Amino acid sequence: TQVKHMMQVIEPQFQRDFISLLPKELALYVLSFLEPKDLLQAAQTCRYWRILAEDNLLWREKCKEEGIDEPLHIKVIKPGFIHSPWKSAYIRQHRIDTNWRRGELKSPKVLKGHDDHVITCLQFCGNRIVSGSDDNTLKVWSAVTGKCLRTLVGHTGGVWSSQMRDNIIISGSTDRTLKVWNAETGECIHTLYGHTSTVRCMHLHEKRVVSGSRDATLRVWDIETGQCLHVLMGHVAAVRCVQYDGRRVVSGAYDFMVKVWDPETETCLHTLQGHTNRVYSLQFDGIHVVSGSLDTSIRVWDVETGNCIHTLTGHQSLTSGMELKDNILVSGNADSTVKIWDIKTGQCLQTLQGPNKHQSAVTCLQFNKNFVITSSDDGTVKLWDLKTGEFIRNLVTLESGGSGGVVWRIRASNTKLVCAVGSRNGTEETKLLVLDFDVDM
Amino acid sequence: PSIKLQSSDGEIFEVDVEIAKQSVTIKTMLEDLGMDPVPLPNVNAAILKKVIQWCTHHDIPVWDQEFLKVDQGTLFELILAANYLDIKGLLDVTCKTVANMIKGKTPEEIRKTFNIKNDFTEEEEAQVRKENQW
Numbered sequence: 357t358q359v360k361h362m363m364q365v366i367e368p369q370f371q372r373d374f375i376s377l378l379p380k381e382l383a384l385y386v387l388s389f390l391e392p393k394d395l396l397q398a399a400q401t402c403r404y405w406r407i408l409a410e411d412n413l414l415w416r417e418k419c420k421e422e423g424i425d426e427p428l429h430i431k432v433i434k435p436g437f438i439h440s441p442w443k444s445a446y447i448r449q450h451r452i453d454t455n456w457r458r459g460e461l462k463s464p465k466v467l468k469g470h471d472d473h474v475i476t477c478l479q480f481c482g483n484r485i486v487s488g489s490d491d492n493t494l495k496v497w498s499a500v501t502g503k504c505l506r507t508l509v510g511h512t513g514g515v516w517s518s519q520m521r522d523n524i525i526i527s528g529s530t531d532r533t534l535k536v537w538n539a540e541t542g543e544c545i546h547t548l549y550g551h552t553s554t555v556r557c558m559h560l561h562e563k564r565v566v567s568g569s570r571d572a573t574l575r576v577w578d579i580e581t582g583q584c585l586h587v588l589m590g591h592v593a594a595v596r597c598v599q600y601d602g603r604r605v606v607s608g609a610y611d612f613m614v615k616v617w618d619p620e621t622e623t624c625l626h627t628l629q630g631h632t633n634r635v636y637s638l639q640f641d642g643i644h645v646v647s648g649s650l651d652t653s654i655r656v657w658d659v660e661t662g663n664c665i666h667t668l669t670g671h672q673s674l675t676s677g678m679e680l681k682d683n684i685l686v687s688g689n690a691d692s693t694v695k696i697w698d699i700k701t702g703q704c705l706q707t708l709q710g711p712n713k714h715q716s717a718v719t720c721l722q723f724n725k726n727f728v729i730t731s732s733d734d735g736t737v738k739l740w741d742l743k744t745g746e747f748i749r750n751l752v753t754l755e756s757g758g759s760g761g762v763v764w765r766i767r768a769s770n771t772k773l774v775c776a777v778g779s780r781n782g783t784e785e786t787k788l789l790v791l792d793f794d795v796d797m
Numbered sequence: 798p799s800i801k802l803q804s805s806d807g808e809i810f811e812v813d814v815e816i817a818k819q820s821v822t823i824k825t826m827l828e829d830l831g832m833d834p835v836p837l838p839n840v841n842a843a844i845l846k847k848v849i850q851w852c853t854h855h856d857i858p859v860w861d862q863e864f865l866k867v868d869q870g871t872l873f874e875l876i877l878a879a880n881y882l883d884i885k886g887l888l889d890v891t892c893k894t895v896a897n898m899i900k901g902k903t904p905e906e907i908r909k910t911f912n913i914k915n916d917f918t919e920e921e922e923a924q925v926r927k928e929n930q931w
Contacts, residue, residue, distance in 0.1 A: 385880075
């Protein structure tokens with residue numbers, strides 16, 4: 357079916373080739389052994405092959421191979437051709453990937469905002485970008501249009517932590533209060549008071565948001581009710597980073613300690629000791645908590661045992677950014693280095709340096725199976741080959757990157773890159789750069 | 798023990814059971830339908846003799862690859878022999894072997910391997926190339 361239907365219509369009859377004669381199925385069981393790259397070539401072979409290399413189910417897999425899961429359905433030329441929603445979905449990715457990799461930068465949608473201020477946190481939840489700024493506001497943008505949709509005006513202190521979950525923006529401010537927001541109406545539906553110090557960080561998980569603050573206590577808030585279900589007290593210093601998987605609350609405070617909490621019973625299940633300094637970044641896959649300290653190291657902990665699993669050393673400075681995914685850790689470090697680790701093996705898979713290494717501190721990083729996107733004080737957002745660890749190109753290169761221009765944070769969707777760009781000095785008007793790496797399909 | 802199976806050619810093959818039961822088809826006919834001589838219409842002695850050779854021998858194995866060094870006719874023959882005999886093993890090896898013949902990019906080259914006439918019109922071929930760009 358579909359493949360059959362194609363033959364009975366295009367009529368690619370008479371083919372003196374091995375696979376054209378093989379029963380449709382077998383020809384497929386054959387082409388299936390080909391990597392997409394090949395299939396694509398095999399598809400340019402002959403109408404017959406093409407029609408085969410187009411077996412929908414054949415790509416539904418090649419896609420689940422590149423983690424597509426969603427086949428795209430484009431939307432009238434001569435001799436019809438039943439395209440595979442998956443082959444196209446796959447190509448879309450290949451192309452998107454390529455558009456990212458060597459795809460010509462289109463001149464990003466500049467989102468002038470937070471004039472003369474720092475976008476202290478960035479949230480990118482499909483088409484909606486939420487820039488948090490120390491200008492006490494947050495702005496919800498359209499990664500699409502690039503137009504500012506709303507400006508979460510409400511905080512009296514600068515916003516320093518933000519979380520979003522479609523229409524639900526949660527901002528943490530120096531003003532000592534989280535604020536739940538309706539990204540659409542931009543209205544503050546809640547003002548979470550309980551934090552006396554600055555709400556530095558906050559990790560939202562479903563209907564709850566654990567917030568970390570300089571007050572040494574994290575607070576689990578019910579994004580819906582606005583209540584503060586719990587208050588994690590056990591941190592001597594300020595909590596710079598927080599991770600909440602809904603089960604536990606991993607925290608990192610300037611107290612060199614990483615506290616694993618069972619929010620429910622406001623009990624510090626674990627006190628991860630190992631960082632000879634302030635733990636700034638945290639990552640937690642529900643199994644491993646990855647603490648990144650100013651102590652230069654990144655400790656991979658076992659949330660269960662609380663036992664340090666790996667003391668990933670290598671960075672020469674403060675590991676600011678840090679993204680954990682599939683036990684693969686990519687740490688952004690002030691050392692201008694980004695590192696990719698196999699937190700399972702503790703191996704430093706890669707180090708993103710090279711002639712095109714970042715010049716100054718790595719401020720943010722995003723990464724998928726293919727690339728590591730790294731922003732830096734050097735005003736450049738670099739695209740790296742996660743796998744090869746090779747620098748690919750600078751997605752962004754603030755002409756001021758060196759004269760004060762900087763890229764604070766970035767968020768990458770599979771198709772676009774949002775970058776909080778700006779500077780302490782008026783050399784880069786604080787804005788968001790929304791690079792779009794989608795393809796015309 | 799051992800059982801006898803008859804190729805399409807009409808050639809009976811005394812192939813040890815189990816060794817032949819690698820072909821669930823043969824197996825099915827031996828354990829379910831119970832064929833004194835397992836009639837294999839789709840497989841001639843030539844190829845059946847080859848599948849057995851492959852079976853009595855049980856990523857492309859460091860042997861199957863040689864055993865399949867044969868020409869396309871045979872390969873194709875085995876693809877079916879395997880498919881007909883339902884010998885996932887042989888089938889995977891052979892089919893892959895073909896695939897490998899394709900794994901090398903370049904449509905033009907892929908043809909030089911399977912003959913294949915480029916039956917794409919002016920615009921068509923272009924479109925096909927544009928669609929399977931890389």
